[PDB]
């Protein structure tokens, strides 16, 4: 979560209908845009961010929210438009002993500006005494590891998250969905459409 | 009725969206008034209010001033659902999990 990936999406045709089959039940909260009307208008640039967090923390990924992941690991702007997609993945990222590959920052001097990355691993001095790199008193290592286990409850099982962000610039839109088609007819008074020509 | 905060602008003649098409349609030549006020103090649960639903999938748009309370499964592909929530087989109603 702390080192959340960033991917650029541009110059493509995107079909969002496929995303409804990820899982029988998965959150699909969309902010500022109706999910069913994502195949009509289109944007200039699309950003996709993917990571893994605890299922209960999934409520902290939303505009105007506060918590620990929200202000220390991943913050969304108040005036945010896009969608968030999260589904259960306990079958794919769980170890009986416990997974340790996922880390999250726990201590930070201040909050996080929306859409900011902080990968620093320098020790956190809680108190006034400078420990200078030893995990003793008032000095704790900021990174903590999710100990994912299939025996955990639904409130602690891993949940994969993919966040889509959209916006408009003066550049022409290129990331637009499919337009479908219909078989041709001839020698009959019919209504026709040819690349937006009524 | 009760709708989401950002969907209050969808209640207007000539608008397009999920609510204006699958849940409530206003005629183009509409006359009258609409009143909408925030009611976060009476329709919110910390656990989550699930009694407020909304339709998401429908075969076709609603004609003005029409009600559709059917709960049948939605068949989004070619394979027929036959009353199961399978692949390309979606339940058309979701919930406004208010908090």
């Amino acid at each position, epitope marked *: 979560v702390y080192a959340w990936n960033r991917k650029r999406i541009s110059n493509c045709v995107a079909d969002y209908s496929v995303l409804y089959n990820l899982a*029988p*039940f998965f959150t699909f909260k969309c902010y500022g845009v109706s999910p069913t009307k994502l195949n009509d208008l289109c944007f200039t640039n699309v950003y996709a961010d993917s990571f893994v967090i605890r299922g209960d923390e999934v409520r902290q990924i939303a505009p105007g929210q506060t918590g620990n992941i929200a202000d220390y690991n991943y913050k969304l702007p108040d005036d945010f438009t896009g969608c968030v997609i999260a589904w259960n993945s306990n079958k794919l990222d769980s170890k009986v002993s416990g997974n340790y590959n996922y880390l999250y920052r726990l201590f930070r001097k201040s909050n996080l500006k929306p859409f900011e990355r902080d990968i620093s691993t320098e020790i956190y001095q809680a108190g006034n005494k400078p420990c200078n790199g030893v995990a003793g008193f008032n000095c704790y290592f900021p990174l903590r590891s999710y100990s994912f286990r299939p025996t955990y*409850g*639904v409130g602690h099982q891993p949940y994969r998250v993919v966040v889509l962000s959209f916006e408009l610039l003066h550049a022409p839109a290129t990331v637009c969905g499919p337009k479908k088609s219909t078989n041709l007819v001839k020698n009959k008074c019919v209504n026709f459409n040819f690349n937006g020509l009524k | 009725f009760v709708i989401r905060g950002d969907e209050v602008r969808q209640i207007a003649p000539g608008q397009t969206g999920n609510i204006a098409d699958y849940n409530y349609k206003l005629p183009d030549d509409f006359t009258g008034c609409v009143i909408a006020w925030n009611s976060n103090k009476l329709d919110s*649960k910390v*656990s989550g209010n*699930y*009694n407020y639903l909304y339709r998401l999938f429908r075969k076709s748009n609603l004609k003005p001033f029409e009600r559709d309370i059917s*709960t049948e499964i939605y068949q989004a592909g070619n394979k027929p659902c036959n009353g199961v929530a399978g692949f390309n087989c979606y*339940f058309p*109603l979701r*919930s406004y999990s208010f908090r």
Partner: nanobody
């Protein structure tokens, strides 16, 4: 109009799992939510959990986590509850309760007669 029927009384050993069913007849089963409550012999009611089969969401009491599983079936319109790791004090009567869509899901509208579960040696 609508009535709920629950299984009979049960006696079982501490080291096992108990199965209880709850059958409801009448109305539209899609707008129904199932909720379970326990009644101690000398004390009052105690909430366990709530299930919404149509929306596919589950939630249980904090101290029953990992021990209670509530399931429902559309084919036979019955509710199944499985409890494991039984102990001494759980001797009580199990009530099956129901929630309608027009009313609140969390609140319990219709109740079954209840089944008595006892564990001893």
């Amino acid at each position: 109009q609508v009535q709920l029927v629950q299984s009979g009384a049960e006696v079982k050993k501490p080291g096992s799992s108990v199965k209880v069913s709850c059958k409801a007849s009448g109305g539209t089963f899609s707008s129904y939510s199932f909720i379970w409550v326990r009644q101690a012999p000398g004390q009052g009611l105690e909430w366990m959990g709530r299930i919404i089969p149509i929306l596919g969401i589950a939630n249980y009491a904090q101290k029953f986590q990992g021990r209670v599983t509530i399931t429902a079936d559309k084919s036979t319109t019955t509710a199944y509850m499985e409890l494991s790791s039984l102990r001494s004090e759980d001797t009580a009567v199990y009530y099956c309760a129901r929630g309608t869509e027009y009313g609140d899901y969390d609140v319990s509208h219709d109740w079954g007669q209840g089944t008595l579960v006892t564990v001893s040696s």
